[PDB]
């Protein structure tokens, strides 16, 4: 596997898991902004934002809080999946337009 | 429950130095002594002089979260709704009183007869406006 | 929102596609994602460039490190898919393989020309090999590459790049190792002579404007942006897509009252130029794919407590 | 410093946070400058509005709740100022939200009536934006400034 | 000293364009802005690179320690 990529920051994650903070290595605004955009479309998410501690440490912090239907880890996964699917839609659309051009 | 309503007629709509907010001055059509001053995001709710606005202050609507499947509340009856705080009351004369509201900085000053504004307290309140 | 709702509303328009540059619109996509593609195209789409330069001699007027630098800026016409990445934890012997690396050589000596037309200024006729060009980088295939690259020799995308100049007696002699890298690391690896976008201009007129005002108003925007309609004689917007947003209108007092200038917030006009190795569309595809893998690689990593 | 006594002293006596006021006259020496003042005049302007998405993002980008300021282990937000036609928060709410997440929860919000450097005339007729009002920890009126 | 390879801001190759640009000014007798356009330099980023280049190298080259003057 690779365990060093994403980790939970257990000092800002609640007991019920409806709220959590993740630290992702080797990622900046590129993925961070895109991921929070997607996550915030999830109707059970009550809060979400990302931040970059410092421009010199390659680290990305994501915060997710839910209204209690799913856990914070769920929202992260739906967001990641949603993001993947969203790219597919773009790739396919672009392909068709190149063909039809 | 509802604390105050009246139909007001707008005198002035001043954009000041902003371009999304305007200061509105308007007088009641029902009370000769009741007048109003209100900052409005006029990009979301355009207002011109001589408009007639119905203005309601209510304590609740019958904590905040994006609208869901089939949510219904007092907001449905109006065009423009703001949430804010009463922060100052003042005696204007032996007969009349003014209350001051802030909606995240957009200020309202409502002056009127002390019996006409009896229900207003120094709490939070919703503001509802429709054309 | 919902991924299907997005699919139904998302749209692509391809204004112009070419071997070097693409002009196309992404419509109804969020700025965060357009921005992602843009960033990725510039900084994370791999390319091949010279990384290590091995000098055996350089008695030209240009210093080694500087010469090495320019060679690194030369865009090599190489398909990055044809190469694997170098592992930078192995010693130099193990580090560079036929799947890893491409070798270029350069070997020029400058001599004086006897047959120079007396009283000449041109260094082509005064000196032999005075000028050294990128095209002078010879591709030396190693191992399996004689086969793999037999159908596509390694050539700089811009042959006529001036690399160095010499005078009689001076020589350059070097081998360069060229590998995969990304723009975020060093800009020599960026596969674009630039990818950027603009939001589609929105010129909305706040009341009809006609007659001599129409003609006046029309001239505050580039040719073709504002049309004057026959009949109503009033001005209307032909295509905002041609507008440069100079805000010229807002200077003339008579108009500043009657026009708001905005954007269609979710409509991105992309322009992508390739440095020469891959086509624009490939570079854009590769970026849309790169973003997706980030999301996929992350979904599959275990979250350590 | 090379031993715990010196550690304790550098963290509790000579530490930067212990030295907000100067001993000369007892006035502040630490504050923000340049970009940050200009930014404040803009962010706290009446013309400043933010969608749910933006509001939440400004909050998290500056709070750093994964710190020693676990005043809560959940970020608190306000309801929007404009409910309808579209949910919008004001800049002044970003400030109130910040204070709300970093001041002690078992303790009432700050109360301040102050002034800033910009005269009311600069905003337009009837403005009160020169007056800085904090009630129960909420910025209800005025912009924030070098002052 | 010698033509830069890429435009500092664009990334666009510019180093293949010096010798031709001179030939445009010289032979075709164009002005500078017309010639820059003909070589494909559109952004002012890129026009600046060729417009204001000083081929100082041609001075350095006149001192060659490896030939009998
Ligand atoms: Zn340039």
UniProtKB/Swiss-Prot annotation, chain B:
Note: Present with 6210 molecules/cell in log phase SD medium.
InterPro entries found in the cross-reference section: NA-bd_OB-fold, RPABC3
Domain of life: Eukaryota
GO biological process: nucleolar large rRNA transcription by RNA polymerase I; ribosome biogenesis; RNA-templated transcription; termination of RNA polymerase I transcription; termination of RNA polymerase III transcription; transcription by RNA polymerase I; transcription by RNA polymerase II; transcription by RNA polymerase III
Gene assigned in the entry: RPB8
PANTHER family the UniProt entry points to: DNA-DIRECTED RNA POLYMERASES I, II, AND III SUBUNIT RPABC3 (PTHR10917:SF0)
Family recorded in the similarity comment: Belongs to the eukaryotic RPB8 RNA polymerase subunit family.
GO molecular function, one term: DNA-directed RNA polymerase activity
Subcellular location: Nucleus
UniProt name for this protein: DNA-directed RNA polymerases I, II, and III subunit RPABC3
Region described as Non-specific ssDNA binding: spans on this chain: 14-37
Function: DNA-dependent RNA polymerases catalyze the transcription. of DNA into RNA using the four ribonucleoside triphosphates as substrates. Common component of RNA polymerases I, II and III which synthesize ribosomal RNA precursors, mRNA precursors and many functional non-coding RNAs, and small RNAs, such as 5S rRNA and tRNAs, respectively.
Cellular component, GO annotation: nucleoplasm; nucleus; RNA polymerase I complex; RNA polymerase II, core complex; RNA polymerase III complex
Keyword annotations from UniProtKB, A to Z: Acetylation, DNA-binding, DNA-directed RNA polymerase, Nucleus, Phosphoprotein, Ribosome biogenesis, Transcription
Swiss-Prot record, chain C:
Protein name: DNA-directed RNA polymerases I and III subunit RPAC1
GO cellular component annotations of the record: nucleoplasm; nucleus; RNA polymerase I complex; RNA polymerase III complex
Function per UniProt: DNA-dependent RNA polymerases catalyze the transcription of DNA into RNA using the four ribonucleoside triphosphates as substrates. Common component of RNA polymerases I (Pol I) and III (Pol III) which synthesize ribosomal RNA precursors and small RNAs, such as 5S rRNA and tRNAs, respectively. RPC40 is part of the polymerase core and may function as a clamp element that moves to open and close the cleft.
GO BP of this protein: nucleolar large rRNA transcription by RNA polymerase I; ribosome biogenesis; termination of RNA polymerase I transcription; termination of RNA polymerase III transcription; transcription by RNA polymerase I; transcription by RNA polymerase III; transcription elongation by RNA polymerase I; transcription initiation at RNA polymerase I promoter
Transmembrane domains' residue ranges: none
Extra remark: Present with 13000 molecules/cell in log phase SD medium.
Main subcellular location of this protein, as a coarse class: nucleus
Residue ranges of coiled coil: none
Family (UniProt): Belongs to the archaeal Rpo3/eukaryotic RPB3 RNA polymerase subunit family.
Gene3D superfamilies: DNA-directed RNA polymerase, insert domain, RNA polymerase, RBP11-like subunit
Subcellular location: Nucleus, Nucleolus
GO molecular function, one term: DNA-directed RNA polymerase activity
GN (gene name): RPC40
UniProtKB/Swiss-Prot annotation, chain D:
Subcellular location: Nucleus, Nucleolus
Sequence similarity: Belongs to the RNA polymerase beta' chain family.
Function of the molecule: DNA-dependent RNA polymerases catalyze the transcription of DNA into RNA using the four ribonucleoside triphosphates as substrates. Component of RNA polymerase I (Pol I) which synthesizes ribosomal RNA precursors. Besides, RNA polymerase I has intrinsic RNA cleavage activity. RPA190 and RPA135 both contribute to the polymerase catalytic activity and together form the Pol I active center. In addition, subunit RPA12 contributes a catalytic zinc ribbon that is required for RNA cleavage by Pol I.
Extra remark: Present with 2840 molecules/cell in log phase SD medium.
Quaternary structure note: Component of the RNA polymerase I (Pol I) complex consisting of 14 subunits: RPA135, RPA190, RPC40, RPA14, RPB5, RPO26, RPA43, RPB8, RPA12, RPB10, RPC19, RPC10, RPA49 and RPA34. The complex is composed of a horseshoe-shaped core containing ten subunits (RPA135, RPA190, RPB5, RPO26, RPB8, RPB10, RPC10, RPA12, RPC19 and RPC40) where RPA135 and RPA190 form the DNA-binding cleft. Outside of the core, RPA14 and RPA43 form the stalk that mediates interactions with transcription initiation factors and newly synthesized RNA.
Protein name as annotated: DNA-directed RNA polymerase I subunit RPA190
Lineage: Eukaryota, Fungi, Dikarya, Ascomycota, Saccharomycotina
Name of the encoding gene: RPA190
UniProtKB/Swiss-Prot annotation, chain E:
Principal location: nucleus
Gene3D superfamilies: Homeodomain-like (1.10.10.60)
Any one of the GO BP annotations: RNA-templated transcription
PROSITE patterns: RNA_POL_N_8KD (PS01112)
Subcellular location: Nucleus, Nucleolus
Molecular function as annotated in GO: DNA binding; DNA-directed RNA polymerase activity; zinc ion binding
InterPro entries: RNA_pol_su_RPB10, RNA_pol_suN_Zn-BS, RPABC5/Rpb10
Cross-link Glycyl lysine isopeptide (Lys-Gly) (interchain with G-Cter in ubiquitin), where in sequence: 59
Keyword Acetylation among record annotations: no
UniProt GO cellular component terms: nucleoplasm; nucleus; RNA polymerase I complex; RNA polymerase II, core complex; RNA polymerase III complex
Pfam family, any one: RNA_pol_N
Binding site for Zn(2+): 7, 10, 45-46
Subunit architecture: Component of the RNA polymerase I (Pol I), RNA polymerase II (Pol II) and RNA polymerase III (Pol III) complexes. Component of the RNA polymerase I (Pol I) complex consisting of 14 subunits: RPA135, RPA190, RPC40, RPA14, RPB5, RPO26, RPA43, RPB8, RPA12, RPB10, RPC19, RPC10, RPA49 and RPA34. The complex is composed of a horseshoe-shaped core containing ten subunits (RPA135, RPA190, RPB5, RPO26, RPB8, RPB10, RPC10, RPA12, RPC19 and RPC40) where RPA135 and RPA190 form the DNA-binding cleft.
Protein family membership: Belongs to the archaeal Rpo10/eukaryotic RPB10 RNA polymerase subunit family.
Record's miscellaneous remark: Present with 5300 molecules/cell in log phase SD medium.
NCBIfam families, A to Z: PRK04016.1
Protein name, as recorded: DNA-directed RNA polymerases I, II, and III subunit RPABC5
Organism listed in the record: Saccharomyces cerevisiae (strain ATCC 204508 / S288c) (Baker's yeast)
